[PDB]
Design an enzyme around this catalytic site. Structure first.
Site, mmCIF file in Angstrom:
data_model
loop_
_atom_site.group_PDB
_atom_site.id
_atom_site.type_symbol
_atom_site.label_atom_id
_atom_site.label_comp_id
_atom_site.label_asym_id
_atom_site.label_seq_id
_atom_site.Cartn_x
_atom_site.Cartn_y
_atom_site.Cartn_z
ATOM 1 N N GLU A 184 -77.262 4.148 -82.320
ATOM 2 C CA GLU A 184 -77.831 2.882 -82.771
ATOM 3 C C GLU A 184 -79.349 2.915 -82.726
ATOM 4 O O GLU A 184 -79.986 2.385 -83.631
ATOM 5 C CB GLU A 184 -77.187 1.757 -81.964
ATOM 6 N N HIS A 241 -73.949 -2.784 -80.799
ATOM 7 C CA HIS A 241 -73.888 -2.812 -79.340
ATOM 8 C C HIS A 241 -75.215 -3.153 -78.692
ATOM 9 O O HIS A 241 -75.238 -3.882 -77.709
ATOM 10 C CB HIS A 241 -73.394 -1.467 -78.796
ATOM 11 N N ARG A 298 -74.590 19.668 -52.883
ATOM 12 C CA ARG A 298 -73.195 19.840 -52.510
ATOM 13 C C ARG A 298 -72.978 20.955 -51.503
ATOM 14 O O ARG A 298 -71.878 21.032 -50.952
ATOM 15 C CB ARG A 298 -72.325 20.080 -53.748
ATOM 16 N N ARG A 322 -64.575 17.471 -56.613
ATOM 17 C CA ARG A 322 -64.504 16.677 -55.385
ATOM 18 C C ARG A 322 -63.043 16.477 -55.003
ATOM 19 O O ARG A 322 -62.209 16.132 -55.849
ATOM 20 C CB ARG A 322 -65.152 15.306 -55.596
HETATM 21 O O1 LIG Z 1 -73.446 14.553 -57.697
HETATM 22 C C1 LIG Z 1 -73.858 13.805 -58.601
HETATM 23 C C2 LIG Z 1 -74.948 12.867 -58.616
HETATM 24 C C3 LIG Z 1 -75.250 12.141 -59.719
HETATM 25 N N1 LIG Z 1 -74.619 12.150 -60.966
HETATM 26 C C4 LIG Z 1 -75.102 11.197 -62.077
HETATM 27 O O2 LIG Z 1 -74.914 9.884 -61.568
HETATM 28 C C5 LIG Z 1 -74.048 9.074 -62.428
HETATM 29 C C6 LIG Z 1 -72.787 8.738 -61.692
HETATM 30 O O3 LIG Z 1 -73.026 8.756 -60.309
HETATM 31 C C7 LIG Z 1 -73.864 9.815 -63.733
HETATM 32 O O4 LIG Z 1 -74.533 9.098 -64.794
HETATM 33 C C8 LIG Z 1 -74.359 11.269 -63.454
HETATM 34 O O5 LIG Z 1 -75.167 11.825 -64.491
HETATM 35 C C9 LIG Z 1 -73.528 13.057 -60.961
HETATM 36 O O6 LIG Z 1 -72.836 13.238 -61.897
HETATM 37 N N2 LIG Z 1 -73.250 13.812 -59.827
HETATM 38 O O1 LIG Z 2 -63.354 -0.558 -83.758
HETATM 39 C C1 LIG Z 2 -63.405 -0.693 -82.532
HETATM 40 C C2 LIG Z 2 -63.462 -1.913 -81.777
HETATM 41 C C3 LIG Z 2 -63.529 -1.867 -80.424
HETATM 42 N N1 LIG Z 2 -63.573 -0.737 -79.605
HETATM 43 C C4 LIG Z 2 -63.663 -0.930 -78.096
HETATM 44 O O2 LIG Z 2 -64.833 -1.672 -77.856
HETATM 45 C C5 LIG Z 2 -65.823 -0.886 -77.121
HETATM 46 C C6 LIG Z 2 -66.930 -0.469 -78.044
HETATM 47 O O3 LIG Z 2 -67.181 -1.452 -79.029
HETATM 48 C C7 LIG Z 2 -65.086 0.262 -76.467
HETATM 49 O O4 LIG Z 2 -64.987 0.039 -75.056
HETATM 50 C C8 LIG Z 2 -63.720 0.346 -77.208
HETATM 51 O O5 LIG Z 2 -62.582 0.429 -76.343
HETATM 52 C C9 LIG Z 2 -63.508 0.471 -80.328
HETATM 53 O O6 LIG Z 2 -63.564 1.545 -79.814
HETATM 54 N N2 LIG Z 2 -63.439 0.405 -81.703
#
Ligand SMILES: O=c1ccn([C@@H]2O[C@H](CO)[C@@H](O)[C@H]2O)c(=O)[nH]1
Ligand SMILES: O=c1ccn([C@@H]2O[C@H](CO)[C@@H](O)[C@H]2O)c(=O)[nH]1
Ligand SMILES: O=c1ccn([C@@H]2O[C@H](CO)[C@@H](O)[C@H]2O)c(=O)[nH]1
Ligand SMILES: O=c1ccn([C@@H]2O[C@H](CO)[C@@H](O)[C@H]2O)c(=O)[nH]1
Ligand SMILES: O=c1ccn([C@@H]2O[C@H](CO)[C@@H](O)[C@H]2O)c(=O)[nH]1
Ligand SMILES: O=c1ccn([C@@H]2O[C@H](CO)[C@@H](O)[C@H]2O)c(=O)[nH]1
Ligand SMILES: [Cl-]
Ligand SMILES: [Cl-]
Ligand SMILES: [Cl-]
Ligand SMILES: [Cl-]
Ligand SMILES: [Cl-]
Ligand SMILES: [Cl-]
Ligand SMILES: [Mg+2]
Ligand SMILES: [Mg+2]
Ligand SMILES: [Mg+2]
Ligand SMILES: [Mg+2]
Ligand SMILES: [Mg+2]
Ligand SMILES: [Mg+2]
Ligand SMILES: [Mg+2]
Ligand code: NA
Ligand code: NA
Ligand code: NA
Lengths: 251, 251, 251, 251, 248, 251
Positions: free
Chosen positions: B77, B5, B220, B165
């Site tokens: 990875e 990836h 919040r 929420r």
């Molecule tokens: O109220 C909040 C603010 C930020 N995030 C962070 O912001 C991303 C999505 O908004 C996520 O990766 C998370 O860790 C939340 O989950 N909640």
């Molecule tokens: O063996 C595999 C091949 C593809 N994916 C898909 O490909 C992305 C990660 O490689 C993910 O969004 C998933 O849905 C897997 O999970 N497994």
């Protein structure tokens, strides 16, 4: 006024807001006598209670007994009497090859292999120490000259099957715990003991500061048997460490 | 030889053993540019990868995307390529009244409201940071002038129902999460975010060091809406803090 | 063999295969003195061990401490020394309005609100007494003039939130236990205590015969903290009952 | 009324009530260019958003990122803007021996190996597609001349241990997932991917129509890491199929 | 040779690979009589077994009794005797306000509120029908004049508390099921019945094709014997036509 | 005054407050004919219903069908018509080597391997019989001269995988039940059947008295096939025992 199990009043505590909580009632007087003006307060069931003075501040020493259930009672009743900080000093079995007898372990989080933690927070909740207590315990342990390890502790409601011991009456371990020692070893877990999951979960979810430091009395991977001398010394070192950690927490 | 990836090789990392892992791909270059000789390595999916040098040592910066699943791929990875320490820098919603927008929170343990953590350890296992990382994060935060809070973080696989929420398409929250924000508030939990439970559980059970520091972008419990200037300055402060925490981990 | 926690050998037990196991270490001597030739054997932690003779047969009396974890240790170590039958005599809170202080309750099955039972059998397994022990307990209670109730017992790893007590430091009860006392009351459960789930599950799954009889020291229809006035009389009645049940089990 | 993460407004969607949702942001433009009048709308984080026209009707194309968490945000925010039908087009690993690279799999139900599905419905609830969407995907796939399989998909919050991959940094898979690939193979499960459990449970419990079609990029009875050479052609085939399935859903 | 409960042999089924499985033993003969040459084979416990012929192919009709446990025995023993496709025809309570008495519901997935499904697959596994069966059931229902709905079904091990009925001896419903009917309603679940979670999970995880079609006999938000008997007749006409679609 | 499934009214029961509940509809008439003035009342689905007179008191005999679900309907509807005591008479597979075909087993608690028990009480609740019923069943069984065992029964929602049978269409048993028969054997469990967990949990949590006695028709550890002769005698003895147990329950 007098709490139901501990048999002490708030006034008996002389203003203490910090408690040192060993598992073994016999350890209580030994801890108190490392401090100034130790005073025996009460003994009921597994709960032996002393007070002492540390740098001019009152500290309580109270045993918990073995396991989360008796620990939860002691913490609850001490909190009712104004105690807000709880330092467990314990004994433990190490499960990693080079975590030796006589070393100190400061728990950074517990595997919740207990039942009482679930009476305070669902399983998702982390059995985590207060960061200040863990910092104070690490400093005190390192400053003592001990060999210290910070890490995860597996905290079990049993001594035998939940620590995957087979040298028992049935010689059987329930499916849940078969293979569990190797699982924890491979996950980097340092040790087994029997109170930290309840203590840390209860306090972290209830506005109380808690930590666990324990002296290694057995290493489940080693075949050499420690002697009485090394064990006495381990016990003595663990209580000097926890009193110094208490000193670091007072204000 | 090149991981599936992230699209990089071990040689591309120039010996880095430490990674800074923001959620947002756009944050990667910003972090890398606080360091020396930043070089773009790859961008595939949510994974933008830079290398830089900090006090002469190579450091990787790699985004995780939102959520435990994409985070788990990045950490795995990078670990295959020799990375052993992972510093998450995030954004977060505070749930306690006096944890203000712009403050920093260093997670001492996560409530595991995710699924990926269970692919590394059963629910009983604590989602806790490496103690050295958490310590470095707290010190770096204090030294940057930030207001910092240490404590428990609720780490959710959703932004909406798992953070209770109701301002949503259906306006409903499944039974499991009804009342959950108040439950965590009363338990002293500081904040919600979306990657720490996976990250901390994966790393603590796999021999890797991890921690999480996040800038508060919303509270919040507060009606006041923070400014744009405030949110930009919060992100800038958080990345200065994480780079300084990295410096502390490298020596 | 000398067992790890109890500090006694098989020879010390003089061939006993039956143990009476109160929670409270101070109740051990009182039970032993209702029998012939009581001899103190050991006291370590919450474990006080006596032996005595009943109708010419050796009987062990050993305290468990509060909770499944410390009970599990006592039972295991006594079974290693040849004990096969375990009669718990306890104190308990009634949750049905017409069960009075001073009544006896013989558990016919336990609600497993503990953790240590799961270290012996999965939750599906019934926390059930040996039928002969339960029968002997009921007959002994009736023959001693006590008022006796047979039924289901809720067995909790905590005294406080798992028994839905609210007169506590936080005044909160976790979601799991909110409404739980009325739930059990409506299901016909008679009482709360803290060791039967662990004891009965471990014994029923391990080839050991067990039962639990407990004296009602409080009715939760009235209050949460038991009155001290009635404790001694209730305890005295319960120990007369359990010794007569032991007599019935010895043939 | 720009949604929080996607950065688009309802007006940007030009009336679209159907979305095609690939995992990979780079796939968005490729899908949109198979339709009429493709227009780039926004890119933020893992969310790249285009609009296009199909048989004269607006369609939105929006990437989800890897995993339930980021998918849940995209679906919610699109639903807030009026989207009611969601066609996921993915990549997948086959677990049955004669399901070959380049085949298409239409999911009829998912094994919920995720966490976000539980934020919409308890585990008992089926992760099932809308019947009309599944019917359209099967017809589009068959009419295109692809080799198509209908069946159950295991939908995992991880790429590595939850798909029982061992060629990893630790080489370990947690107990829960040990033997899991053979378990699913023996149960007739066709494939692994990482978003369907969340997408299907969220939509089926929220009044939204969803399905999942994915191109097989690896057969897991052979190996763990997909070969690069076949990725482009499989993806091209899969997006032709999903656009035809969208045509069938319009009218 | 002779399975433990059903009391029939493989030869008795005359090569059938498809079974129609109603819950009620009294419905078996009614179904077999819509087909050719119906013959009674056995009756033991809740299991009444007939064979008939549909377009020249043998079909077995076998009741399951109420609930996953008795259903799982019938399916297993029929599979031992060569049956590979299982069409459940049932009765059901609708929980959506405009799903009317007399309508047909074809289950696209079941909420697993049972226990026997867990004896075949962990809870994470979807209780979903075979796609060809669900497609045949929908087409048969449409082609027979019925008003048909496709959707999710809550499949309960009880008729009373697991369907959140309070008109009972205790008048109580355990915590797990309190509020559950409104929960399913709000999630778009169509109906309650008592066998589809077990049947669909068992078959989907065992290499067997299965589906469930049920006639609505009550609406929990909103009838006569004439209504109720008409509903059963329509449901069995639908299931036999679905079997025809599955055969050739 | 006519329940939905059983097809009887309260008046039809002639005052009966006790029911004998076999699984098999064909057993009902046989049981009723051991009593006085048997009267056929109704037959619908798996529910064949008779009444008869025992020592001048009306008794109901009603089949349950196989499994907790059909049992739960029969118990509920009989309780609506005034029945308060339920005696199950069953057939069973013994799993311990010396529990022979033709022996009687009286269940003291059930392993809840069913689903319907959870519709009355959470898993922690014990599936235990009423103590008076179990006492009456033991007495009737022993007085008949049968060989009787008291103990735990594993109560399964399936005949095949939940009893770890491999002689099946797939020849597979899901992970949960792999090794389960040996697990129960080693835990001392006597037998498998398919209704006691639901019956006992439902009644013990609903104010109804219940118990289960069953005749052993197969021993899973013995290779000898019992005769048709032995099986018919076993059934005859089981129904005479349950009728005598009923006599004991009438004041
Ligand atoms: O109220 C909040 C603010 C930020 N995030 C962070 O912001 C991303 C999505 O908004 C996520 O990766 C998370 O860790 C939340 O989950 N909640
Ligand atoms: O063996 C595999 C091949 C593809 N994916 C898909 O490909 C992305 C990660 O490689 C993910 O969004 C998933 O849905 C897997 O999970 N497994
Ligand atoms: O291997 C060991 C050594 C010590 N302990 C501690 O010692 C007591 C019982 O031996 C308990 O309180 C427990 O915390 C263990 O659990 N395991
Ligand atoms: O209301 C009560 C009264 C007594 N106990 C018993 O008394 C001890 C603690 O008070 C425990 O061992 C427990 O079994 C309770 O649990 N609850
Ligand atoms: O509201 C209703 C109507 C019918 N059924 C079906 O009817 C039988 C019991 O009445 C079961 O087999 C079940 O599938 C229900 O569960 N609920
Ligand atoms: O090995 C056996 C023998 C008998 N039964 C009983 O017989 C019926 C099915 O054969 C069920 O009601 C069950 O209680 C079993 O479960 N297992
Ligand atoms: Cl902290
Ligand atoms: Cl650490
Ligand atoms: Cl017994
Ligand atoms: Cl649908
Ligand atoms: Cl299918
Ligand atoms: Cl009872
Ligand atoms: Mg293992
Ligand atoms: Mg609540
Ligand atoms: Mg409630
Ligand atoms: Mg729908
Ligand atoms: Mg509710
Ligand atoms: Mg095993
Ligand atoms: Mg009762
Ligand atoms: Na104790
Ligand atoms: Na993502
Ligand atoms: Na049945």
């Amino acid at each position: 006024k007098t709490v139901f199990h501990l048999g002490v009043t708030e006034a008996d505590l002389n203003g203490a807001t910090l408690a040192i909580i060993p598992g073994d009632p016999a350890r209580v007087q030994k801890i108190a006598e490392l401090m100034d003006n130790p005073v025996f307060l009460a003994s009921h069931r597994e709960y032996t209670v002393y007070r002492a003075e540390l740098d001019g501040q009152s500290v309580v020493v109270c045993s918990t007994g073995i396991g989360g259930p008796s620990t939860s009672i002691a913490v609850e009743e001490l909190a009712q009497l104004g105690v807000r900080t709880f330092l467990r000093v314990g004994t433990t079995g190490a499960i990693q090859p080079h975590v030796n007898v006589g070393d100190m372990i400061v728990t950074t989080g517990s595997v919740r292999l207990d039942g009482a933690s679930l009476h305070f927070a669902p399983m998702e909740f982390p059995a985590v120490p207060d960061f200040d207590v863990a910092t104070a315990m690490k400093a005190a342990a390192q400053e003592s000259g001990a060999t210290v390890h910070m890490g995860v502790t597996a905290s079990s409601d049993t001594f035998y099957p939940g620590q995957e011991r087979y040298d028992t009456f049935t010689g059987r371990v329930v499916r849940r715990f078969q293979g569990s020692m190797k699982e924890w070893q491979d996950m980097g877990v340092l040790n087994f003991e029997m109170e930290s999951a309840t203590l840390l979960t209860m306090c972290a979810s209830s506005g109380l500061k808690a930590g666990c430091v324990a002296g290694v009395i057995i290493n489940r991977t080693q075949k050499e048997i420690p002697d009485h001398a090394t064990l006495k010394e381990t016990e003595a070192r663990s209580i000097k460490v926890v009193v110094e950690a208490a000193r670091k927490m007072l204000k």
